[model samples]
Target: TLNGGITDMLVELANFEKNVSQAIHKYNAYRKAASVIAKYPHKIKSGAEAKKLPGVGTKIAEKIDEFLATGKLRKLEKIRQDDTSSSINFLTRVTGIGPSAARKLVDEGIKTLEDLRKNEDKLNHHQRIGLKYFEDFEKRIPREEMLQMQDIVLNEVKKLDPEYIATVCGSFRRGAESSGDMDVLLTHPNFTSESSKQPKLLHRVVEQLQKVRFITDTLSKGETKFMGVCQLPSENDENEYPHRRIDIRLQPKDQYYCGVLYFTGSDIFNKNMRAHALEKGFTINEYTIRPLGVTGVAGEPLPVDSEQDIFDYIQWRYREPKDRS
Candidate 1:
């Protein structure tokens, strides 16, 4: 989450655009503005002044002005009070339910979990699994639990191939006391973005996880990514653990550091870092970093051996993931 302040409302507005309006660009706009505002060096007293900052557009500036004057944005208030909008927001919280699907459910008068249960046949397998674990997913995972799960995953990854490099990124990597989900970035020396994909690198790890019953339900899977639910096995006297959301991405070895830098984000930090990269005449993203030509075209991807190399290339001081938040 963004550092609390005006950024909270912007986040709410972002989710409103994502869920009710289904305007993805608007969502991105609100999010980018929130990121910039959260990191602004000085407190902004006026939207017009805020407009001077990168990523804060005129419309977002106006919204900030409204917030400053009234202590709330009327647009956000309206979204909060609208039944259709609130219903979509509620439904979209369920894993696998995107805005369009949530809107479809609202249109069918299926606004509540009970309504969903009554119309179970209307949902697909992934949606069904999501509904089944809705309550568990809503609860956050503790750092201790996260560590235990991490150990389980790492142990399994090493058992399969000692050469496989796996790192747990996201909030956990940023030193969060708890996290919404677990994300692991996997890489192998043989896999490169330019090389033909080796699907087995991903599948073997996932299949091994499944064999140990560590991965309970799969939401989606592809050659490079896997999204699913995982739970720690129960001990003799301890209660069963809640099923937690998990995502594992199999990245190319050459691009693994970039992937790590991207995933270990407080998105606000990533946005600010990208902005800094642009100012330094370079472009950086999950796949690679490249120099910008005089004509504004990007050059070939640079060789980045570590996360620090990326920051060095752009001349930004390296920040450990723990400091990202």
Candidate 2:
């Protein structure tokens, strides 16, 4: 069984790979190392026992040694340090998300977003709206405008179905100062099929928003997907805001959390979580999370009513969409 001590370290190491350096290979290695450790019948004290496991490599065995030696890895200390502000500064020092924007991250002592994720203040309206839109056209939206768009979309979507859960994801979720575009995800109990018998919810919702002029043009549409550009109604013709691109996707209630997790991502974070799923002998996606048979074949969808269920399956710590960024 995955006990407390080794379990905790593995999770942080996984986060380092997915959320920190983004060296996917490291995440996989840690996950496999953790898995082998978990399955061992007894608590492992040193790197020697870890070396004998099926997937454990010499480097992983060395990591185990470091853990037993100092109780923490020097590498994880940077990640173990703080939350957004200094993290933003830390980011400025390291991997520049956009272009050649910064140096190679703070190799010296550094801490940011990860530290205060839970204790941090709640999202103000600006951050809330920013998070609702995922990624788009690669251009940027000022924070003020991101709020405006969130307000309009929130109001319009609500008028259609108060039960329709809609929110943005992406850089906005990370609380970035600005964002490239909007990604809106929708979930409703009524949108469960491809047949006409379904509520016709997606199209009707789009139609309603269109009638209000919030959605300016149809880039494209389908049974349950909306992709296009939307601009605020000009105070008049010349007072135009750029046509910011947006996407509205419909997901089934049963699998909504899957989309919730998928859209509410920061790539390495997503990969990290999925890697945990694999470690647990399971697989996860935007629809369902299933178990894997001994030969690595997938089992049927289990009852996943929310994102929590997915995390629970893999024994990974659960993070709110806000904390995810």
Candidate 3:
């Protein structure tokens, strides 16, 4: 059983890898150390005991000793002390800005939110959308709001195609207190033959929503996903608020489960999972999984009909909607 200290360390290490795109070898060291610590039946009695665990070399054992004595790791301390490192970490919190763009912001002296707002031209399409909703996007959506959004989407889907299946995944499905954005996954059993034409659903939804003035701005509308700013009906007349961010994805029913898992991610978890999948000689993505080719590229996509089938093929335990986090 893992103790709280080991759990916290593991989370921190994972975040460092996921958020900052740290080298996998470093991540592996921390992850392996954390796993070993977690499996210990009781508190680590000695450095010798800790060293006995696989992957817990002498240097890692020393670090573990430092953690036991000072209740902190010097490695994490050094990472925190670097200004650029911390700023990149903060910028990545925004939904669209990944490590590469975040580094660009740092290099350009755009370290803070105010700096970003002052220099809007520096951002691209996705990053601009991110900047506009910097605060709202960061704020979690309440359950009530999620329910309302779900109802709105489902109603629209039903009107367009009665057979369409639209679902809310991510933190919303996992019983999170709030969600970063609405991830609506749309699919239909009959969409297999019409997968190429499924993207039109996004256009229809945007067109309908825009006519009512609910959708304020079109961010990116394409075949697979549509992202936009939307506003919910409000009771207060004085609140002239900006629109909320909405992401709508259309996938074939055969790829629904893989698509759901990919979209519902915290970003980091998705990256790690994909990397793990690749390491195991399988290539995983939002649409399908296939064997790794000789050149390490994904081969032709394999058929996936359900979420369980994905887990079975990957050999990982099935994570329920609520357990995704």
Candidate 4:
């Protein structure tokens, strides 16, 4: 079917072709068409209908038709098999390696993860970590592991203060079977409003988690936010507990529900919500939902005691968080 499967192949082709002889214009063209196709609610039925979609020109439309006829694209399959493009594609997977660096490595005949390991001096610190955990990090975290991690952080957090709000957002909170990482939000009763000064509670909770070995490595830390790596406990040395990505964000109590809604979003939903807010003469965000004043300037923040409050302001019929996907 010409659903996400078709879009996925298109994305793979787009990235592989992106740095092939530095054909960035072709990359953009492929990506634009894929982006539009991915958002279509139903499977695309024909080459003619696909061609009518924005950003899809003659070539991409024909590519779609070809895939529909045979369930494969010869060019995409070739790139996966070919050496230089495959190596470049692998190099680009590292967090710090850009298209230019990837192409340079391809020129140097650095053809695999093993090649990067042998030439460690060429990589920056972050890319080295990327290589070390490349295979493990590529694996998704099971919801069971997410639940275990959530229990660890939230249980520890409440011990520090009973009223604190801690939740694992993103796909896990949306009830996905697996997640790429944990995205946890933290807010407390004491932080009832926005302020210029950062709060110490966030730092303290992060320290609490790190001290317990729930967090293993620091990516970045601040007064009210922590982004890092974490792991789950295993018994009898029977399993490898791979490092996983997690984010903990500290929000004000008054903004907590709005923060939860935004953090727990499908990106498309958020954009549409913002568009609806603007159409209704209001503005909505993680922190505030405010109405426009006489000058068309946003007025003071509205009362959002719950996610429903924000919906009420915009006259949107609220969809429960679990169904947001």
User: How badly does each model clash, as a count of residue pairs?
Assistant: 0, 14, 0, 0
TM-score of each: 0.75, 0.54, 0.60, 0.68
Task: Rank candidates, lDDT, best first.
Answer: 1, 4, 3, 2
Worst 10 residues of 1 by lDDT: 1-10
Whichever of 2 and 4 has more lDDT, that candidate is: 4
- Model 3 CA deviation exceeding 4 Å by range: 1-82, 93-96, 124-126, 189-198, 237-242, 265-284, 289-303, 308-319
Q: Write the per-residue lDDT of candidate 3 for residues 235-271, one digit (tens) a residue.
A: 6777544457887887888778788888777577778
**Which residue pairs show collisions in model 3?**
none
Task: State how far residue 11 of model 2 sits from its true place (Å).
Answer: 46
In Å, residue 173's CA in model 3 sits off its true spot by 1.1
RMSD of each: 12.7, 17.2, 11.4, 10.4
Candidate 4 to truth, TM = 0.68
For each candidate, what is the lDDT? 0.90, 0.69, 0.75, 0.82
* Candidate 1 segments exceeding 4 Å error: 1-82, 236-239
**What is candidate 4's lDDT per residue for 1-325, written digit by digit as tens?**
4477678877887776666547787788888888888887778877778898898899888888888888888877767766575677879887567778888877886767888888988887657766777787798998888888989998999999898888878988889898998888889877767555456878888888889888877766777787777878676576678988778999998888889889999888888888998988898888999997666788899888888989988998988877776
Pairs clashing in candidate 1? Answer: none
Cα distance off (Å), candidate 2, residue 75: 45
What tens-digit string does per-residue lDDT give for candidate 2 at 106-218?
A: 23232333322332243233222222332333357887887888888888889877898887766775676787778888878766533233436778777777887878666
Predicted model with the maximum TM-score: 1
